Design a protein around this ligand. Sequence first.
Ligand code: 3D2
Ligand code: 3D2
Length: 426
Amino acid sequence: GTVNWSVEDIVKGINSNNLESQLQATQAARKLLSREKQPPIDNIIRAGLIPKFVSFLGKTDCSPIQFESAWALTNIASGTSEQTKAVVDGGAIPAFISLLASPHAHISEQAVWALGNIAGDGSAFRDLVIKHGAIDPLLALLAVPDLSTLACGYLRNLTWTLSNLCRNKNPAPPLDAVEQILPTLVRLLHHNDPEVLADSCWAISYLTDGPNERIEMVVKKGVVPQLVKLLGATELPIVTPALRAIGNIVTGTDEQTQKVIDAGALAVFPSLLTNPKTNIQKEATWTMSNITAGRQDQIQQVVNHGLVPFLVGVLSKADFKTQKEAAWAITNYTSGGTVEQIVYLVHCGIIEPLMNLLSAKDTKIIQVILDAISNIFQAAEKLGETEKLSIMIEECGGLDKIEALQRHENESVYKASLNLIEKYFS
Ligand SMILES: NCCCC[C@H](NCc1cccc(-c2cccnc2)c1)C(N)=O
Ligand SMILES: NCCCC[C@H](NCc1cccc(-c2cccnc2)c1)C(N)=O
């Protein structure tokens, strides 16, 4: 009946003076916009159908045409930014918000999905969805004693849309909106469905992707222990945002970082730092680099949990971007650490992999490593053992790499190189 209509016929039906003809044509449009291979979204838009779809959203008396038009519109709004804008410009946002409280679950759910795609397009549309009042009725759909009584797909949909209201930057979402959403987020974060957990984790990672005040309003809700638990999950779609969130949180204050350690995060890092997924290992090392930039007592906890050999491991062998993060973790450790902590680092074998990376055609990691070497000598000076350190560096071929850096493009590299040589190598 409604399979593979032409746009011309859809237009004829929607323009008819007959609600049933309009319904049948709207369903035809929905199916056309749903096809996997290149759905003719721009042709539907050019045909002027968006405002007609939007007017159908208001037909309380005909719930099937509300549903079909909602679905058609959602198909369009899930496209490019220009296509999402066409839907918003047709007046769809308040129409969809009014549909959240529909008695028909299928329709409500379609409106949830539409608003998530609109909000997800960017900061301005996100904020516009919020200004039209979407948050209260969305939260109201989750106001049941036990989330398990809700249909799984319905709950995943709501969680995903809430995560889009948390998502973008410049600006970040309104503080007021974040505080309104966060308690429901915390509740979703302990719900036993992997997709809900993943999307809740993503939402938390967005909210913590900012200044310390933003991190604080999340941490104050007490979610860090649950994040650390999820960090240990077997499902990669859960571990990835949980680690992103934890990583964001330790870019904050010493106290915020301490909550992460206190919750037992460091015990997961032997696995994370050797994870077969490259981006997990990269993000875990980044996280370590922010922890070693903390207090000496926090560095000591990294030591105590046996993580220094793992950092030596990543420095020794890893995707290059991961090795760069490891170099940062080592520079931060040596800038901030006690003499005894720095000695321990050398006893763990940091020198050879550090020196091997001076071969890297990448100016930034080089300065970073030279910085680390300078820091280690400084600790050695306080023990009167630069000579022993110099021999070490000399034996693994480090002197040759530093001397080769004499004749190198960069001024910081040059200067730092020659300084090290004349100061510690005859
Ligand atoms: N002074 C501005 C800040 C300088 C320090 C720092 N550079 C951050 C930075 C640089 C390069 C890479 C990352 C990174 C990589 C992988 C995962 N996660 C992150 C992070 C930052 N916090 O922006
Ligand atoms: N005062 C504490 C916060 C700043 C710490 C300070 N700045 C550098 C710093 C701290 C933490 C992480 C990074 C970093 C840079 C690039 C890539 N990945 C990670 C850099 C330092 N040298 O310890």
